[PDB]
Design an enzyme around this catalytic site. Structure first.
Site, PDB file in Angstrom:
ATOM      1  N   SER A   3      24.311  17.367   1.051  1.00 31.19           N
ATOM      2  CA  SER A   3      24.459  18.548   1.918  1.00 31.19           C
ATOM      3  C   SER A   3      23.593  19.745   1.517  1.00 31.19           C
ATOM      4  O   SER A   3      23.107  20.474   2.377  1.00 31.19           O
ATOM      5  CB  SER A   3      25.938  18.957   2.045  1.00 31.19           C
ATOM      6  OG  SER A   3      26.506  19.367   0.817  1.00 31.19           O
ATOM      7  N   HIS A  58      25.462  25.823  -0.801  1.00 30.78           N
ATOM      8  CA  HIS A  58      24.698  25.521   0.400  1.00 30.78           C
ATOM      9  C   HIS A  58      23.683  26.620   0.705  1.00 30.78           C
ATOM     10  O   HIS A  58      22.575  26.337   1.162  1.00 30.78           O
ATOM     11  CB  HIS A  58      25.657  25.305   1.570  1.00 30.78           C
ATOM     12  CG  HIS A  58      26.348  23.976   1.529  1.00 30.78           C
ATOM     13  ND1 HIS A  58      27.551  23.741   2.159  1.00 30.78           N
ATOM     14  CD2 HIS A  58      25.989  22.805   0.954  1.00 30.78           C
ATOM     15  CE1 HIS A  58      27.903  22.481   1.973  1.00 30.78           C
ATOM     16  NE2 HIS A  58      26.974  21.891   1.245  1.00 30.78           N
TER      17      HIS A  58
END
Ligand SMILES: CCCCCCCCCO[C@@H]1O[C@H](CO)[C@@H](O)[C@H](O)[C@H]1O
Ligand SMILES: CCCCCCCCCO[C@@H]1O[C@H](CO)[C@@H](O)[C@H](O)[C@H]1O
Ligand SMILES: CCCCCCCCCO[C@@H]1O[C@H](CO)[C@@H](O)[C@H](O)[C@H]1O
Ligand SMILES: CCCCCCCCCO[C@@H]1O[C@H](CO)[C@@H](O)[C@H](O)[C@H]1O
EC number: 3.4.21.105
Length: 180
Positions: free
Chosen positions: A111, A164
């Site tokens: 991710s 992220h």
């Protein structure tokens, strides 16, 4: 037209590791592939990267690999394997570092790399159109939905929002540099 070597090998590696996790269980595989979780493991250098190969649910691996296939595939085809290798290594290291710093060493998946690729492909297309690389208008919408899913914990992705953002920063930074 088929996915290049880097795009392909990464996908097969993640599937192989995912299978190992179903057979042996997540914990046994993390024992070997997770970011160093004890001083005795600080010099097992592969661990600063192997965490990216582990996924914890069907949806986790399914969507990570769909995005990697599309974005990574595009980057490798149009910009070369070397470009994809660097974006991947840097984003995996930085997102992993940030994740570990605030949430511990137990995490995994692509991710963080996907956030980097989304940022790279999108920004490169906005600043350097004729570069050939860009994020399809319609796909910008679904990329945003995928981002929102993880951001508000509607979809478990292992990594936290800060990690992220670190990955996204790598992609944006490299895209900025490339359109320079
Ligand atoms: C919400 C999920 C995100 C959308 C996923 C879209 C996947 C589109 C995959 O396309 C494929 O990409 C390869 C690599 O570039 C090409 O080699 C191949 O010919 C092409 O068929
Ligand atoms: C970093 C991965 C997530 C993508 C983020 C997209 C930014 C928000 C979308 O607004 C922008 O609106 C413009 C005006 O219509 C479009 O032309 C452009 O394509 C679109 O980007
Ligand atoms: C669970 C979400 C699944 C979403 C599936 C969306 C399919 C439509 C996306 O098409 C893809 O668009 C890319 C950009 O144009 C092409 O490069 C690629 O070849 C094509 O396959
Ligand atoms: C920018 C918003 C970042 O969000 C925060 O990022 C931290 C680091 O990942 C998480 O520990 C925390 O839960 C999350 O709220």
């Amino acid at each position: 037209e088929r996915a290049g070597p880097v795009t392909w090998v990464m996908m097969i590696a993640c599937v192989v590791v995912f299978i190992a996790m179903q057979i042996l269980g997540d914990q046994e595989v993390m024992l070997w592939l997770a970011w160093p979780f004890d001083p005795t493991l600080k010099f097992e250098f592969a661990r600063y990267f192997t965490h990216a190969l582990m996924h914890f649910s069907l949806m986790h691996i399914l969507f990570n690999l769909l995005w990697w296939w599309y974005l990574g595939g595009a980057v490798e085809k149009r910009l070369g394997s070397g470009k994809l290798i660097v974006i991947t290594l840097i984003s995996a290291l930085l997102s992993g570092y940030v994740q570990q710093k605030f949430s511990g060493p137990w995490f995994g998946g692509l991710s963080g790399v996907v956030y980097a690729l989304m940022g790279y492909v999108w920004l490169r297309g906005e600043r350097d159109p004729q570069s050939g690389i860009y994020l399809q208008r319609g796909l910008i919408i679904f990329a945003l939905i995928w981002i929102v899913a993880g951001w508000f914990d509607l979809f478990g992705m292992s990594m936290a929002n800060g990690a992220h953002i670190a990955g996204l920063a790598v992609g944006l930074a490299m895209a900025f540099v490339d359109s320079l």
